[PDB]
């Protein structure tokens, strides 16, 4: 069957939060069947543990932020995108500060870390959620939609357009390395308000409103929209189970992505859990 997956070994990384500029240790730990992804702030006294699910998303300014009371874990989207990408169902993530490290601005480092810990298949069927009926949410000129589709595909447009199928196209090769990005004008403002403190050309693409300022250039011709697809995959993983359907994003950010998840969850007629006792017949394959 398509089994649930966790990490083989504990693995650690160090980095800096994009927004906070704070040094943070990130420890990924194997977890048992039906755990999901749980975060653990190990700097707080007492430690605060926060499941990576839709209901725990509290703020959605420039990143997905998990909250419990007055305690936050923000910028979970790139790490969760890596998890989704490698099909990791269960893991503990222990963090020494409020923000996940930015690493190189992409999911690449996290993908490589997860693989370096080794994957461990677990003897329990992996539960997917099938989209049975179209579900969409909008607000102004933003739109977020799930459409039925026997597989998993993402199409996204921003202010430009990319479509990726995760049967034909490798998350690792074509999406994982896409770095976050910002406009100088924006970056200047955020720095003035004590934000983006961990930002640099080493973990973010910088453009004015003309050209890429990074000396070494782009990793993909359409890196910007590819990164937005990466973010949506991460935000969609807060569902807590892998999706069988097509997601269409039109200028959709963290807030509207979480709103789509909430609507889908509450609209039970639109979805159903399914497992695959035969990996050959399954619409989604992992490594
Ligand atoms: O939609 C987006 C991108 C999606 C977003 N990234 C961000 O917010 C984001 C914010 C700030 C930075 C920076 C910086 C820096 C670079 C060099 C020196 C000093 C500082 C990079 C990314 C993200 O990755 N969300 O998950 N708009 C660009 C935001 C600003 O125009
Ligand atoms: Zn964002
Ligand atoms: Zn991002």
């Amino acid at each position: 069957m398509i089994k649930q997956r966790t990490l083989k070994n504990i693995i650690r990384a160090t980095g800096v939060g994009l927004h906070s500029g704070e040094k943070v240790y990130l420890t990924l730990k194997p977890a048992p069947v039906d755990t999901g992804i749980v975060f653990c702030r190990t700097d707080l006294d007492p430690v605060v543990e926060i499941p990576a699910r839709a209901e725990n998303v509290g703020e959605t300014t420039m990143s997905t932020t998990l909250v419990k009371g007055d305690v936050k874990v923000d910028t979970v989207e790139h790490l969760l995108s890596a998890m989704a990408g490698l099909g990791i169902d269960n893991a503990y993530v222990e963090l020494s500060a409020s923000e996940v490290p930015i690493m190189d601005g992409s999911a690449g480092p996290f993908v490589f870390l997860i693989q370096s810990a080794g994957l461990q298949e677990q003897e329990a069927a992996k539960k997917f959620i099938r989209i049975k009926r179209e579900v969409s949410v909008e607000e102004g000129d933003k739109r977020a939609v799930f459409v039925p589709f026997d597989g998993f595909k993402v199409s996204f447009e921003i202010d430009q357009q990319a479509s990726v199928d995760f049967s034909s196209t490798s998350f690792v090769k074509e999406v994982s390395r896409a770095r976050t990005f910002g406009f100088m004008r924006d970056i200047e403002y955020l720095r003035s308000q004590n934000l983006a403190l961990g930002g640099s050309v080493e973990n973010a693409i910088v453009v004015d409103e003309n050209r890429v300022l990074n000396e070494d250039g782009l990793r993909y011709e359409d890196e910007f929209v590819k990164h937005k697809i990466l973010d949506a995959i991460g935000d969609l993983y807060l569902l807590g189970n892998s999706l069988i359907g097509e997601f269409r994003g039109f200028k959709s950010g963290h807030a509207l992505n979480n709103q789509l998840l909430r609507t889908l969850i509450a609209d039970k007629d639109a979805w159903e859990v399914v497992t695959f006792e035969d990996a050959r017949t399954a619409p989604i394959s992992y490594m």
Side-chain angles (χ1 to χ4, degrees):
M1 31 142 186
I2 303 276
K3 290 161 187 196
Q4 297 186 29
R5 207 172 277 207
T6 187
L7 270 66
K8 208 185 304 307
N9 302 127
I10 300 181
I11 209 174
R12 312 166 177 78
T14 80
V16 192
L18 176 64
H19 295 300
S20 71
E22 283 169 11
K23 186 199 185 157
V24 54
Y25 301 102
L26 175 67
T27 311
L28 304 184
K29 332 259 266 47
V33 163
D34 298 329
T35 309
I37 318 282
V38 185
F39 286 84
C40 319
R41 281 285 302 278
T42 50
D43 59 312
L44 281 180
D45 213 355
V47 307
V48 189
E49 314 260 337
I50 307 168
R53 12 221 296 119
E55 59 179 311
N56 293 336
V57 176
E59 165 191 10
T60 55
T61 262
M62 286 159 301
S63 28
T64 303
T65 299
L66 303 171
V67 308
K68 213 188 188 192
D70 61 343
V71 165
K72 62 139 186 271
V73 171
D74 66 322
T75 325
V76 300
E77 60 263 23
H78 307 143
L79 172 56
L80 290 173
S81 187
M83 295 288 194
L86 296 177
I88 307 302
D89 297 287
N90 312 120
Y92 298 108
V93 181
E94 334 235 328
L95 279 202
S96 63
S98 70
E99 192 170 4
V100 183
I102 195 53
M103 312 305 284
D104 75 356
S106 81
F110 293 135
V111 162
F112 183 67
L113 197 70
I114 299 159
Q115 294 280 47
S116 292
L119 269 38
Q120 182 58 47
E121 271 196 308
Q122 299 173 292
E123 301 302 308
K126 168 184 187 87
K127 289 165 252 175
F128 297 81
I129 291 166
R130 201 184 288 263
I131 302 300
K132 276 139 62 45
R133 187 171 73 188
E134 190 184 287
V135 177
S136 82
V137 293
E138 47 176 18
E139 181 169 23
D141 62 358
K142 310 167 161 24
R143 184 177 175 83
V145 191
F146 290 130
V147 170
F149 175 69
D150 191 23
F152 184 65
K153 182 164 177 196
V154 186
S155 303
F156 208 96
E157 335 185 348
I158 41 64
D159 267 314
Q160 200 139 346
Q161 197 281 337
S163 290
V164 177
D165 190 327
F166 296 102
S167 70
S168 321
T169 333
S170 164
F171 176 83
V172 165
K173 293 154 146 156
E174 307 263 28
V175 163
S176 87
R177 279 176 67 257
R179 298 166 290 173
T180 187
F181 60 93
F183 293 79
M184 191 64 63
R185 132 195 93 81
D186 275 317
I187 291 167
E188 278 166 12
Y189 183 66
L190 291 170
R191 283 289 181 91
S192 90
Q193 310 308 298
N194 258 336
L195 289 173
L197 299 177
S200 84
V201 287
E202 316 267 272
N203 57 41
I205 305 155
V206 184
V207 34
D208 283 50
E209 231 270 304
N210 35 196
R211 25 143 212 155
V212 180
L213 301 203
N214 298 248
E215 215 73 9
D216 288 327
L218 299 182
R219 297 175 169 182
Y220 308 113
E221 116 232 317
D222 60 346
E223 193 167 355
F224 303 106
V225 67
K226 287 252 198 125
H227 192 262
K228 293 307 199 161
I229 290 165
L230 184 159
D231 290 334
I233 293 157
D235 291 338
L236 266 17
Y237 214 48
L238 296 160
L239 188 53
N241 299 280
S242 285
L243 202 87
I244 306 167
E246 173 186 18
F247 166 88
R248 307 187 177 156
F250 308 89
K251 313 175 190 183
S252 191
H254 303 299
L256 193 63
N257 292 335
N258 193 65
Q259 270 103 274
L260 173 66
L261 283 190
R262 292 188 181 214
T263 293
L264 177 72
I265 288 160
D267 197 0
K268 275 198 291 141
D269 285 8
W271 62 270
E272 186 179 359
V273 173
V274 57
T275 55
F276 299 95
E277 294 203 341
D278 183 75
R280 273 269 175 286
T281 70
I284 297 185
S285 60
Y286 300 89
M287 41 205 137

